[PDB]
Amino acid sequence: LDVNFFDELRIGLATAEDIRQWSYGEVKKPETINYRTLKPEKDGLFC
Amino acid sequence: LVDRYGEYFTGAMGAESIQKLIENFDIDAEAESLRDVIRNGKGQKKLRALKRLKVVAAFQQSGNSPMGMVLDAVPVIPPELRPMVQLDGGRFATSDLNDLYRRVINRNNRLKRLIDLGAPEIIVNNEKRMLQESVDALFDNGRRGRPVTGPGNRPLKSLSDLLKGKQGRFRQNLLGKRVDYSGRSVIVVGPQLKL
Amino acid sequence: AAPVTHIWYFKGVPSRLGYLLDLAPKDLEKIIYFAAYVITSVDEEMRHN
Amino acid sequence: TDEELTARFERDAIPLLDQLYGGALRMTRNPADAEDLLQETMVKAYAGFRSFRHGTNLKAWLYRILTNTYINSYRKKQRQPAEYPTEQITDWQLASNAEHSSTGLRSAEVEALEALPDTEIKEALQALPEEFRMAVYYADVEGFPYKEIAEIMDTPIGTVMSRLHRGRRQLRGLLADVARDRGFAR
DNA sequence: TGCATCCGTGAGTCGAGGGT
DNA sequence: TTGTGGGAGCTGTCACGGATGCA
RNA sequence: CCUCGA
């Protein structure tokens, strides 16, 4: 639990390496969720 | 120029070309040149040089490279921050962000399909420009050309819009909030009170 | 499948790219959106020989 | 020859695509949708261009490809959730959705009380003997399988299940008004 | 290189209910 | 996947500063 | 967003 005493807030430009170090997996499909079961499709925007 | 002399140079279109330029770009060399133009020049040349030097010196004084200005990979915001909810009527409501990411995905996948199929260079260039424009929408819709629209002709609020104006996160959710332990009602006079 | 340019840095006035590479933004729109080519490198020695 | 006929494809077909963009725009009303449809059409055309009868009107052939690619995508939408975009889904919408959801928009108070003791339940449990309470806790709250809750407490399966059934009985002896206070008497 | 034009910015606060 | 095939609105806003583009 | 309230 953060004790809320930050010294500085810095911006830079994200390197594609940074963008990949953030990511937990590539989204590959445009589907969101199945209409039948309302469940999030694999590799989709809500995977 | 390519049929003859094609093996004496490299040329190309698009962001890949801009990336190759930024690669071969010597920040120290151009920075020294701009400092020279500022020190020994005058008039409009001096003004333009100071303008360009702000960018160049900023990129060299900080250790971050200008390559970051060209993306090979696009991040994707967590899905709770772009929710999707079912409504009365069996219809759904999605944040505009999902339609924008979805167009980016469709165009990237169609580009991959074309590249695998060895499509004509004109069609693959069409798909590359389309991918570029869809990422332009995802980042800041309407800044260049026609805004991507949803039903009823409304421009899809992009990741830039999420921050601007009294609607954006700053003025709507960080400089003022909705709070608990609070209420509201009509006021009447009640002269019997003490101050 | 193909890299793209961050629109904050191409179209954000004043074009940060246009100042970086010393290109006029009109030419940058021609290049980034496939209206014109650009020379990324030229083998000067081979041309000379 | 394969590549010569792809050059021929470019030369013969590209102006047709110039006009087919306007066609697809008329039939989709969204320029982004029209560009997507035209590029899909060109994908299908370049994939099946060997099957084109040379010399005839490629205009009608490509226009039919465009018409069929529009007709197939209209049916693709009829199998995926009907989505409608908005700047910001409203509170009435978050609330309406929460009305039919399995968790709903829970208040801080709700979650505060769930983190405080359930006084009726805590005292019923503390009434039970220690071993009965443990065999009931693991099995009924922590869902451990019976051999694994035997792995805990270092007691055989029979001992654990005797303790479980008899502690369930005793705790049902207590808690009798709690089950009526709540909906468990039904 | 010298400007004219164009384009990008900003344009009060808090409420109620209705609900593609 | 073959005789022909090009959108729906839009503007009834305004002051200001600085890039951008033109010649 | 619309119509409304101060």
Short mmCIF file of C-alpha atoms (C1' of nucleotides) in Angstrom, two decimals:
data_model
loop_
_atom_site.label_atom_id
_atom_site.label_comp_id
_atom_site.label_asym_id
_atom_site.label_seq_id
_atom_site.Cartn_x
_atom_site.Cartn_y
_atom_site.Cartn_z
CA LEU A 1 0.00 0.00 0.00
CA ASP A 2 1.64 3.19 -1.27
CA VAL A 3 2.34 5.68 1.54
CA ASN A 4 1.77 8.55 -0.94
CA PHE A 5 5.12 10.37 -0.67
CA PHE A 6 6.41 10.64 -4.22
CA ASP A 7 9.30 12.93 -5.02
CA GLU A 8 8.97 13.26 -8.79
CA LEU A 9 6.76 12.40 -11.76
CA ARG A 10 8.75 12.02 -14.99
CA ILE A 11 7.68 11.54 -18.61
CA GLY A 12 9.73 10.22 -21.46
CA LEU A 13 8.92 8.66 -24.80
CA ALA A 14 8.05 4.99 -24.70
CA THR A 15 10.40 2.77 -26.62
CA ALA A 16 8.79 -0.12 -28.48
CA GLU A 17 10.87 -2.17 -26.04
CA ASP A 18 9.11 -0.34 -23.19
CA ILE A 19 5.73 -0.88 -24.86
CA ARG A 20 6.55 -4.59 -24.96
CA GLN A 21 7.86 -4.69 -21.37
CA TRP A 22 4.49 -3.31 -20.28
CA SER A 23 2.42 -5.73 -22.34
CA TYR A 24 1.05 -9.01 -20.99
CA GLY A 25 0.31 -10.31 -24.51
CA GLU A 26 -0.46 -9.19 -28.05
CA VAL A 27 -4.08 -8.65 -29.04
CA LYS A 28 -4.52 -10.33 -32.41
CA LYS A 29 -8.26 -10.62 -33.08
CA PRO A 30 -10.90 -7.88 -33.48
CA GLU A 31 -13.59 -9.91 -31.69
CA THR A 32 -14.55 -8.74 -28.20
CA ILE A 33 -16.94 -11.29 -26.66
CA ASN A 34 -19.10 -14.08 -28.03
CA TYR A 35 -22.76 -13.17 -28.51
CA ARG A 36 -23.91 -16.61 -27.31
CA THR A 37 -22.01 -17.00 -24.03
CA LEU A 38 -21.02 -13.34 -23.38
CA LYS A 39 -17.49 -14.54 -22.75
CA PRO A 40 -14.32 -12.73 -23.92
CA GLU A 41 -12.81 -14.31 -27.03
CA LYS A 42 -9.21 -15.50 -26.83
CA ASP A 43 -6.54 -13.08 -28.11
CA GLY A 44 -9.23 -10.39 -28.44
CA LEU A 45 -9.67 -6.91 -27.03
CA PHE A 46 -10.99 -8.38 -23.75
CA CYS A 47 -8.95 -11.60 -23.65
CA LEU B 1 15.50 6.00 -61.13
CA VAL B 2 15.10 2.46 -59.77
CA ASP B 3 15.11 0.49 -63.04
CA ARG B 4 18.50 2.09 -63.78
CA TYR B 5 20.75 3.04 -60.81
CA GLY B 6 18.50 1.07 -58.42
CA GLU B 7 21.55 -0.43 -56.67
CA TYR B 8 23.20 2.93 -55.89
CA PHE B 9 20.70 4.23 -53.28
CA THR B 10 17.74 3.25 -51.11
CA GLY B 11 14.39 5.01 -51.32
CA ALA B 12 10.97 4.37 -49.88
CA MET B 13 7.63 5.79 -48.76
CA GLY B 14 6.10 6.13 -45.32
CA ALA B 15 7.02 5.83 -41.69
CA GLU B 16 9.54 3.09 -42.48
CA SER B 17 11.40 5.69 -44.53
CA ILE B 18 11.14 8.23 -41.73
CA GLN B 19 12.50 5.59 -39.35
CA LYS B 20 15.46 4.89 -41.62
CA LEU B 21 16.11 8.65 -41.74
CA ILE B 22 16.04 8.91 -37.94
CA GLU B 23 18.50 6.01 -37.81
CA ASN B 24 21.16 7.69 -40.00
CA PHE B 25 20.46 10.97 -38.24
CA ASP B 26 23.44 12.48 -36.41
CA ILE B 27 21.99 14.51 -33.53
CA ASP B 28 25.37 15.91 -32.49
CA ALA B 29 26.20 16.98 -36.06
CA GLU B 30 22.88 18.73 -36.73
CA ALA B 31 22.92 20.22 -33.22
CA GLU B 32 26.39 21.70 -33.78
CA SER B 33 25.28 23.04 -37.17
CA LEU B 34 22.20 24.67 -35.64
CA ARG B 35 24.24 26.21 -32.81
CA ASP B 36 26.59 27.57 -35.48
CA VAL B 37 23.69 29.05 -37.48
CA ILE B 38 22.39 30.68 -34.29
CA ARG B 39 25.75 32.08 -33.20
CA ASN B 40 26.84 33.53 -36.55
CA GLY B 41 23.52 34.15 -38.33
CA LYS B 42 20.77 36.73 -38.05
CA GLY B 43 17.18 37.35 -39.06
CA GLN B 44 14.73 34.61 -40.01
CA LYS B 45 17.49 32.01 -40.35
CA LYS B 46 18.36 32.64 -36.70
CA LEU B 47 14.70 32.29 -35.67
CA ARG B 48 14.11 29.01 -37.53
CA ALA B 49 17.42 27.70 -36.20
CA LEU B 50 16.48 28.42 -32.57
CA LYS B 51 13.11 26.74 -33.11
CA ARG B 52 14.68 23.57 -34.56
CA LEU B 53 17.41 23.61 -31.91
CA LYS B 54 14.86 23.41 -29.10
CA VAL B 55 13.78 19.99 -30.43
CA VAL B 56 17.27 18.74 -31.37
CA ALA B 57 18.99 19.84 -28.16
CA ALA B 58 16.11 18.39 -26.13
CA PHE B 59 16.63 15.05 -27.88
CA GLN B 60 20.39 15.11 -27.27
CA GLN B 61 20.39 16.60 -23.75
CA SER B 62 18.08 13.79 -22.64
CA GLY B 63 19.36 10.32 -23.44
CA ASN B 64 16.14 9.25 -25.17
CA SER B 65 16.32 8.71 -28.89
CA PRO B 66 14.04 10.17 -31.58
CA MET B 67 13.27 6.60 -32.70
CA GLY B 68 10.45 6.65 -30.14
CA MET B 69 8.60 9.02 -32.49
CA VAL B 70 7.91 6.00 -34.76
CA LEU B 71 6.00 3.01 -33.40
CA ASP B 72 6.45 -0.61 -34.35
CA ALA B 73 4.18 -1.60 -31.45
CA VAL B 74 1.01 0.09 -30.19
CA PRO B 75 0.04 -0.38 -26.51
CA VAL B 76 -3.48 -1.34 -25.47
CA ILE B 77 -5.11 0.24 -22.40
CA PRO B 78 -6.61 -2.22 -19.86
CA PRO B 79 -10.17 -3.28 -20.77
CA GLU B 80 -11.75 -1.96 -17.56
CA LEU B 81 -10.69 1.53 -18.72
CA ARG B 82 -12.60 0.90 -21.98
CA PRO B 83 -15.64 -0.93 -20.62
CA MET B 84 -18.44 -2.67 -22.47
CA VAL B 85 -21.90 -3.02 -20.92
CA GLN B 86 -25.13 -4.71 -21.95
CA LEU B 87 -28.19 -2.47 -22.24
CA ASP B 88 -31.93 -2.94 -22.18
CA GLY B 89 -32.65 -4.18 -25.70
CA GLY B 90 -29.94 -6.83 -26.07
CA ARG B 91 -27.61 -4.17 -27.48
CA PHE B 92 -24.20 -3.29 -26.07
CA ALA B 93 -22.40 -0.02 -25.38
CA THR B 94 -18.63 0.22 -25.90
CA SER B 95 -16.19 3.02 -25.37
CA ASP B 96 -14.98 4.60 -28.60
CA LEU B 97 -11.49 3.32 -27.73
CA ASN B 98 -12.60 -0.24 -28.56
CA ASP B 99 -13.85 0.69 -32.04
CA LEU B 100 -10.56 2.52 -32.66
CA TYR B 101 -8.35 -0.37 -31.48
CA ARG B 102 -10.59 -2.69 -33.52
CA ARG B 103 -9.98 -0.71 -36.71
CA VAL B 104 -6.24 -0.73 -35.98
CA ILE B 105 -6.42 -4.52 -35.57
CA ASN B 106 -8.46 -5.08 -38.75
CA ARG B 107 -6.06 -2.97 -40.81
CA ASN B 108 -2.91 -4.55 -39.35
CA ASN B 109 -4.31 -8.04 -39.98
CA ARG B 110 -5.35 -7.17 -43.54
CA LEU B 111 -1.87 -5.74 -44.07
CA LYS B 112 -0.33 -8.99 -42.83
CA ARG B 113 -2.62 -10.92 -45.18
CA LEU B 114 -1.62 -8.76 -48.15
CA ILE B 115 2.10 -9.00 -47.31
CA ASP B 116 1.85 -12.79 -47.16
CA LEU B 117 -0.12 -12.94 -50.44
CA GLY B 118 2.52 -10.80 -52.16
CA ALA B 119 -0.15 -8.33 -53.22
CA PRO B 120 0.57 -5.46 -55.64
CA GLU B 121 2.69 -2.71 -54.12
CA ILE B 122 -0.11 -0.18 -54.64
CA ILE B 123 -2.61 -2.23 -52.63
CA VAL B 124 -0.11 -2.90 -49.84
CA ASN B 125 0.67 0.83 -49.76
CA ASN B 126 -3.07 1.49 -49.46
CA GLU B 127 -3.20 -0.87 -46.48
CA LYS B 128 -0.14 0.74 -44.88
CA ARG B 129 -1.59 4.25 -45.20
CA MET B 130 -4.87 2.92 -43.78
CA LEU B 131 -3.11 1.37 -40.78
CA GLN B 132 -1.27 4.67 -40.24
CA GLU B 133 -4.50 6.67 -40.38
CA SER B 134 -6.27 4.30 -37.99
CA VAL B 135 -3.45 4.71 -35.46
CA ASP B 136 -3.76 8.46 -36.01
CA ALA B 137 -7.43 8.12 -35.02
CA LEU B 138 -6.67 5.92 -32.00
CA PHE B 139 -4.13 8.46 -30.72
CA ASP B 140 -5.78 11.78 -31.67
CA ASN B 141 -8.85 11.52 -33.88
CA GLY B 142 -9.69 14.39 -36.22
CA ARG B 143 -6.25 16.04 -36.01
CA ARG B 144 -5.54 15.01 -39.63
CA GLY B 145 -8.30 14.66 -42.21
CA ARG B 146 -11.79 13.36 -41.58
CA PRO B 147 -12.42 12.05 -38.04
CA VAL B 148 -13.42 8.42 -37.74
CA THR B 149 -17.13 8.49 -36.97
CA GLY B 150 -19.60 6.29 -35.18
CA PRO B 151 -23.35 6.12 -35.77
CA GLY B 152 -25.01 9.49 -36.05
CA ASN B 153 -21.78 10.99 -37.45
CA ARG B 154 -20.06 11.56 -34.21
CA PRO B 155 -16.25 11.65 -34.01
CA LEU B 156 -14.92 8.90 -31.79
CA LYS B 157 -13.34 10.37 -28.68
CA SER B 158 -9.72 9.24 -28.83
CA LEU B 159 -7.04 8.85 -26.17
CA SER B 160 -6.20 12.53 -26.62
CA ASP B 161 -9.79 13.65 -25.95
CA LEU B 162 -9.82 11.64 -22.72
CA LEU B 163 -7.49 14.32 -21.31
CA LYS B 164 -8.60 17.65 -22.86
CA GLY B 165 -11.22 20.14 -21.74
CA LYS B 166 -13.50 20.08 -18.71
CA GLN B 167 -14.57 16.60 -19.82
CA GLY B 168 -11.08 15.11 -19.66
CA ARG B 169 -9.49 13.32 -16.73
CA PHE B 170 -7.71 16.43 -15.46
CA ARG B 171 -10.60 18.85 -14.99
CA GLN B 172 -13.36 16.25 -14.57
CA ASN B 173 -11.76 13.54 -12.42
CA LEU B 174 -8.59 14.91 -10.83
CA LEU B 175 -9.15 18.60 -10.05
CA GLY B 176 -12.71 17.85 -8.95
CA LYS B 177 -14.54 14.64 -8.10
CA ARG B 178 -17.83 13.25 -6.87
CA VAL B 179 -17.66 12.59 -3.15
CA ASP B 180 -19.33 10.46 -0.50
CA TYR B 181 -20.99 11.71 2.71
CA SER B 182 -22.76 14.45 0.78
CA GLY B 183 -26.27 15.49 -0.13
CA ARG B 184 -28.36 18.31 -1.57
CA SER B 185 -31.78 19.88 -1.19
CA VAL B 186 -33.85 23.04 -1.63
CA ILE B 187 -33.05 25.93 0.72
CA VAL B 188 -35.64 27.85 2.74
CA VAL B 189 -35.04 30.86 4.93
CA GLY B 190 -35.61 29.88 8.55
CA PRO B 191 -34.98 33.22 10.32
CA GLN B 192 -34.99 31.58 13.78
CA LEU B 193 -31.39 30.41 13.38
CA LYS B 194 -28.19 31.73 14.85
CA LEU B 195 -25.43 32.63 12.42
CA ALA C 1 3.24 -5.24 -39.85
CA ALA C 2 4.57 -1.80 -40.82
CA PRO C 3 5.69 0.96 -38.44
CA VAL C 4 3.65 4.13 -38.02
CA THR C 5 4.39 7.66 -36.88
CA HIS C 6 2.98 9.05 -33.66
CA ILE C 7 0.57 11.74 -34.82
CA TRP C 8 1.57 13.88 -31.83
CA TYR C 9 4.97 14.34 -33.46
CA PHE C 10 4.09 14.62 -37.16
CA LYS C 11 0.96 16.80 -37.09
CA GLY C 12 1.33 18.42 -33.68
CA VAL C 13 2.07 22.02 -34.63
CA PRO C 14 4.95 22.80 -34.83
CA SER C 15 5.87 19.41 -36.34
CA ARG C 16 8.50 17.94 -34.05
CA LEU C 17 9.59 15.60 -36.84
CA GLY C 18 9.69 18.43 -39.36
CA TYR C 19 11.99 20.33 -37.03
CA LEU C 20 14.06 17.22 -36.23
CA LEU C 21 14.86 16.15 -39.81
CA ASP C 22 14.44 19.69 -41.22
CA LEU C 23 11.55 18.73 -43.50
CA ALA C 24 8.58 20.91 -44.36
CA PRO C 25 5.41 19.31 -42.91
CA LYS C 26 3.71 19.26 -46.33
CA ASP C 27 6.49 16.97 -47.58
CA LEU C 28 6.11 14.89 -44.40
CA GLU C 29 2.42 14.37 -45.16
CA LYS C 30 3.39 13.37 -48.69
CA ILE C 31 5.88 10.81 -47.36
CA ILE C 32 4.08 9.34 -44.33
CA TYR C 33 0.83 8.90 -46.29
CA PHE C 34 2.43 7.47 -49.46
CA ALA C 35 2.21 10.45 -51.81
CA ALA C 36 5.95 10.68 -52.53
CA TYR C 37 9.15 8.76 -51.93
CA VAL C 38 12.19 9.86 -49.96
CA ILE C 39 15.85 8.88 -50.30
CA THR C 40 16.91 7.11 -47.11
CA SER C 41 20.56 6.61 -48.18
CA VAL C 42 22.80 6.87 -51.24
CA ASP C 43 26.05 4.98 -51.86
CA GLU C 44 28.25 7.97 -52.71
CA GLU C 45 31.43 5.94 -53.29
CA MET C 46 29.83 3.51 -55.75
CA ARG C 47 28.16 6.36 -57.65
CA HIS C 48 31.55 8.06 -57.82
CA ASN C 49 33.30 4.93 -59.14
CA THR D 1 3.63 -16.88 -66.33
CA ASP D 2 2.65 -15.83 -62.81
CA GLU D 3 4.32 -12.45 -62.17
CA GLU D 4 3.74 -11.05 -65.66
CA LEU D 5 0.02 -11.62 -65.16
CA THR D 6 0.17 -9.82 -61.79
CA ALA D 7 1.68 -6.81 -63.56
CA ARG D 8 -1.14 -7.15 -66.09
CA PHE D 9 -3.54 -7.27 -63.11
CA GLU D 10 -2.19 -3.98 -61.77
CA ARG D 11 -2.37 -2.27 -65.17
CA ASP D 12 -5.87 -3.45 -66.05
CA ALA D 13 -7.53 -3.23 -62.63
CA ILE D 14 -6.23 -0.21 -60.67
CA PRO D 15 -8.56 2.44 -62.25
CA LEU D 16 -11.43 0.03 -61.61
CA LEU D 17 -10.51 0.22 -57.90
CA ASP D 18 -10.45 4.01 -58.15
CA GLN D 19 -14.13 3.90 -59.15
CA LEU D 20 -15.03 1.00 -56.84
CA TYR D 21 -14.04 3.14 -53.86
CA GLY D 22 -16.89 5.47 -54.77
CA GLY D 23 -19.17 2.47 -55.23
CA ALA D 24 -18.36 1.02 -51.80
CA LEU D 25 -18.71 4.50 -50.28
CA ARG D 26 -22.22 4.78 -51.70
CA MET D 27 -23.08 1.38 -50.26
CA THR D 28 -21.50 1.83 -46.79
CA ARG D 29 -21.79 5.62 -46.12
CA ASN D 30 -18.63 5.59 -43.94
CA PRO D 31 -15.32 6.41 -45.69
CA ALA D 32 -13.33 4.22 -43.29
CA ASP D 33 -15.76 1.37 -43.84
CA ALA D 34 -15.52 2.02 -47.59
CA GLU D 35 -11.72 1.83 -47.57
CA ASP D 36 -11.89 -1.39 -45.54
CA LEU D 37 -14.42 -2.86 -47.97
CA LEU D 38 -12.38 -1.86 -51.02
CA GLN D 39 -9.19 -3.36 -49.60
CA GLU D 40 -11.04 -6.58 -48.74
CA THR D 41 -12.37 -6.60 -52.31
CA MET D 42 -8.84 -6.23 -53.66
CA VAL D 43 -7.65 -9.05 -51.40
CA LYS D 44 -10.33 -11.35 -52.82
CA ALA D 45 -9.71 -10.19 -56.40
CA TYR D 46 -5.94 -10.65 -56.32
CA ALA D 47 -6.44 -14.05 -54.68
CA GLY D 48 -8.81 -15.21 -57.41
CA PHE D 49 -7.52 -13.31 -60.44
CA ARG D 50 -6.33 -16.41 -62.30
CA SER D 51 -10.03 -17.41 -62.49
CA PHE D 52 -10.90 -14.28 -64.51
CA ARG D 53 -11.78 -14.62 -68.20
CA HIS D 54 -9.35 -12.27 -69.96
CA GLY D 55 -10.77 -9.69 -72.35
CA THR D 56 -14.30 -9.51 -70.89
CA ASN D 57 -15.51 -6.69 -68.63
CA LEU D 58 -13.54 -6.82 -65.37
CA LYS D 59 -15.62 -3.85 -64.19
CA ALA D 60 -18.68 -6.04 -63.58
CA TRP D 61 -16.58 -8.86 -62.11
CA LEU D 62 -14.89 -6.59 -59.56
CA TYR D 63 -18.19 -4.84 -58.78
CA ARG D 64 -19.71 -8.24 -58.02
CA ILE D 65 -16.76 -9.05 -55.76
CA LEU D 66 -17.42 -5.78 -53.93
CA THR D 67 -21.15 -6.52 -53.67
CA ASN D 68 -20.50 -10.00 -52.30
CA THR D 69 -17.89 -8.78 -49.80
CA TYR D 70 -20.44 -6.26 -48.52
CA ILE D 71 -23.08 -9.01 -48.39
CA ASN D 72 -20.81 -11.33 -46.41
CA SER D 73 -19.81 -8.70 -43.82
CA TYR D 74 -23.45 -7.76 -43.17
CA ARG D 75 -23.96 -11.39 -42.08
CA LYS D 76 -20.73 -11.45 -40.09
CA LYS D 77 -22.16 -8.70 -37.88
CA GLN D 78 -25.35 -10.72 -37.28
CA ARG D 79 -23.29 -13.27 -35.30
CA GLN D 80 -21.25 -10.85 -33.15
CA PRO D 81 -22.51 -8.63 -30.31
CA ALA D 82 -24.24 -5.51 -31.61
CA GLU D 83 -21.90 -2.77 -30.41
CA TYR D 84 -22.67 0.96 -30.26
CA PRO D 85 -19.92 3.46 -29.34
CA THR D 86 -20.21 6.43 -27.00
CA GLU D 87 -17.85 9.00 -25.52
CA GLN D 88 -18.66 7.88 -21.99
CA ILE D 89 -21.16 5.29 -20.84
CA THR D 90 -23.48 6.98 -18.39
CA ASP D 91 -24.22 6.31 -14.74
CA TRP D 92 -27.77 5.27 -15.58
CA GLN D 93 -26.15 2.81 -17.98
CA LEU D 94 -23.62 1.50 -15.47
CA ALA D 95 -26.53 1.13 -13.05
CA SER D 96 -28.92 -0.56 -15.48
CA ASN D 97 -26.17 -3.02 -16.37
CA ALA D 98 -25.44 -3.63 -12.68
CA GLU D 99 -29.10 -4.53 -12.17
CA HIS D 100 -28.65 -7.82 -14.03
CA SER D 101 -25.04 -8.59 -13.10
CA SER D 102 -23.68 -11.13 -10.64
CA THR D 103 -21.83 -8.58 -8.49
CA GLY D 104 -23.23 -5.12 -9.14
CA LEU D 105 -21.86 -1.75 -8.04
CA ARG D 106 -21.02 -2.48 -4.41
CA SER D 107 -20.79 0.30 -1.85
CA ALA D 108 -17.84 0.91 0.45
CA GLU D 109 -20.15 0.11 3.37
CA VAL D 110 -21.11 -3.27 1.89
CA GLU D 111 -17.44 -4.15 1.63
CA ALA D 112 -16.65 -2.74 5.06
CA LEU D 113 -19.22 -4.99 6.72
CA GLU D 114 -17.99 -8.05 4.80
CA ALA D 115 -14.52 -7.36 6.28
CA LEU D 116 -15.98 -7.01 9.79
CA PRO D 117 -17.12 -10.06 11.76
CA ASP D 118 -20.58 -11.47 11.15
CA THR D 119 -21.36 -11.43 14.85
CA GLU D 120 -24.09 -14.07 14.70
CA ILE D 121 -21.81 -16.38 12.71
CA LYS D 122 -18.55 -15.72 14.60
CA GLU D 123 -20.13 -16.63 17.95
CA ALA D 124 -21.79 -19.77 16.58
CA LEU D 125 -18.40 -20.89 15.26
CA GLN D 126 -16.59 -20.02 18.50
CA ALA D 127 -19.17 -22.14 20.33
CA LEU D 128 -18.05 -25.29 18.49
CA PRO D 129 -15.07 -27.23 19.85
CA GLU D 130 -11.75 -26.35 18.24
CA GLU D 131 -11.42 -29.48 16.10
CA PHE D 132 -15.06 -29.44 14.98
CA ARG D 133 -14.65 -25.77 14.08
CA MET D 134 -11.48 -26.50 12.10
CA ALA D 135 -12.91 -29.45 10.17
CA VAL D 136 -15.96 -27.33 9.38
CA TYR D 137 -13.91 -24.26 8.41
CA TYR D 138 -11.54 -25.95 5.95
CA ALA D 139 -14.22 -28.05 4.23
CA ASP D 140 -17.15 -25.61 4.16
CA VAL D 141 -15.32 -22.30 3.62
CA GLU D 142 -11.97 -23.21 2.02
CA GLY D 143 -13.36 -26.06 -0.10
CA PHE D 144 -10.34 -28.30 0.43
CA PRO D 145 -11.00 -31.87 -0.77
CA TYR D 146 -11.46 -34.37 2.04
CA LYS D 147 -8.11 -36.11 1.62
CA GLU D 148 -6.37 -32.70 1.55
CA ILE D 149 -8.11 -31.43 4.70
CA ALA D 150 -6.99 -34.75 6.17
CA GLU D 151 -3.48 -33.71 5.08
CA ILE D 152 -4.16 -30.74 7.33
CA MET D 153 -4.91 -31.34 11.03
CA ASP D 154 -2.89 -34.59 10.71
CA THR D 155 -5.92 -36.86 11.09
CA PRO D 156 -7.28 -39.63 8.83
CA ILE D 157 -10.16 -39.16 6.43
CA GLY D 158 -12.65 -40.92 8.71
CA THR D 159 -11.82 -38.69 11.68
CA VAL D 160 -12.08 -35.56 9.54
CA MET D 161 -15.45 -36.58 8.07
CA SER D 162 -16.89 -37.57 11.45
CA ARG D 163 -15.79 -34.17 12.80
CA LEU D 164 -17.21 -32.43 9.72
CA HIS D 165 -20.67 -34.03 9.88
CA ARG D 166 -21.01 -33.69 13.65
CA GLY D 167 -19.80 -30.08 13.66
CA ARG D 168 -22.24 -29.29 10.86
CA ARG D 169 -25.00 -30.80 13.01
CA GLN D 170 -23.98 -28.87 16.13
CA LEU D 171 -23.56 -25.58 14.25
CA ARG D 172 -27.02 -26.23 12.78
CA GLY D 173 -28.21 -26.55 16.39
CA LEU D 174 -26.91 -23.05 16.91
CA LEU D 175 -27.51 -20.65 14.01
CA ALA D 176 -31.14 -21.84 13.87
CA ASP D 177 -32.48 -18.29 14.15
CA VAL D 178 -29.80 -16.97 11.79
CA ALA D 179 -30.98 -19.41 9.12
CA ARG D 180 -34.52 -18.11 9.64
CA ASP D 181 -33.38 -14.47 9.80
CA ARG D 182 -31.80 -15.18 6.40
CA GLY D 183 -33.35 -17.25 3.63
CA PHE D 184 -32.02 -20.70 4.51
CA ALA D 185 -35.15 -22.09 6.17
CA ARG D 186 -36.86 -22.53 2.78
"C1'" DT E 1 12.92 36.03 -47.43
"C1'" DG E 2 8.78 38.39 -46.50
"C1'" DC E 3 4.81 38.18 -45.22
"C1'" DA E 4 -0.66 36.29 -45.93
"C1'" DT E 5 -3.16 32.64 -44.95
"C1'" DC E 6 -4.54 28.93 -42.31
"C1'" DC E 7 -4.94 26.39 -38.61
"C1'" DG E 8 -5.14 25.28 -33.93
"C1'" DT E 9 -6.57 27.10 -29.34
"C1'" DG E 10 -10.09 28.65 -25.92
"C1'" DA E 11 -14.91 29.95 -24.93
"C1'" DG E 12 -19.03 29.47 -16.06
"C1'" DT E 13 -20.69 26.10 -12.01
"C1'" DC E 14 -23.79 22.76 -9.95
"C1'" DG E 15 -28.93 20.11 -10.50
"C1'" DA E 16 -33.33 16.81 -12.58
"C1'" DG E 17 -35.02 13.00 -15.86
"C1'" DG E 18 -34.92 10.61 -20.62
"C1'" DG E 19 -32.16 6.26 -22.19
"C1'" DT E 20 -30.72 5.50 -29.43
"C1'" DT F 1 -18.17 -14.49 -57.96
"C1'" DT F 2 -19.12 -10.59 -65.42
"C1'" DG F 3 -23.38 -5.83 -70.38
"C1'" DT F 4 -23.98 0.07 -65.56
"C1'" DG F 5 -22.12 1.67 -61.61
"C1'" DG F 6 -18.83 8.40 -57.22
"C1'" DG F 7 -21.79 10.28 -49.96
"C1'" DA F 8 -24.41 13.00 -46.58
"C1'" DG F 9 -24.16 16.74 -45.01
"C1'" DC F 10 -22.27 21.21 -44.74
"C1'" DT F 11 -21.49 27.49 -42.53
"C1'" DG F 12 -25.60 31.44 -39.44
"C1'" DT F 13 -19.11 31.87 -34.36
"C1'" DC F 14 -15.35 34.59 -32.96
"C1'" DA F 15 -10.66 36.64 -31.05
"C1'" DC F 16 -5.81 35.51 -30.94
"C1'" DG F 17 -0.94 33.70 -32.04
"C1'" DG F 18 2.18 31.54 -34.49
"C1'" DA F 19 3.53 27.95 -37.89
"C1'" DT F 20 3.12 26.97 -42.71
"C1'" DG F 21 3.39 27.62 -47.25
"C1'" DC F 22 3.95 30.39 -51.43
"C1'" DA F 23 6.47 33.27 -54.79
"C1'" C G 1 -26.73 15.02 -26.08
"C1'" C G 2 -31.90 17.00 -25.30
"C1'" U G 3 -35.44 19.70 -22.38
"C1'" C G 4 -35.43 22.04 -17.88
"C1'" G G 5 -33.82 24.35 -12.70
"C1'" A G 6 -30.57 28.74 -10.06
#
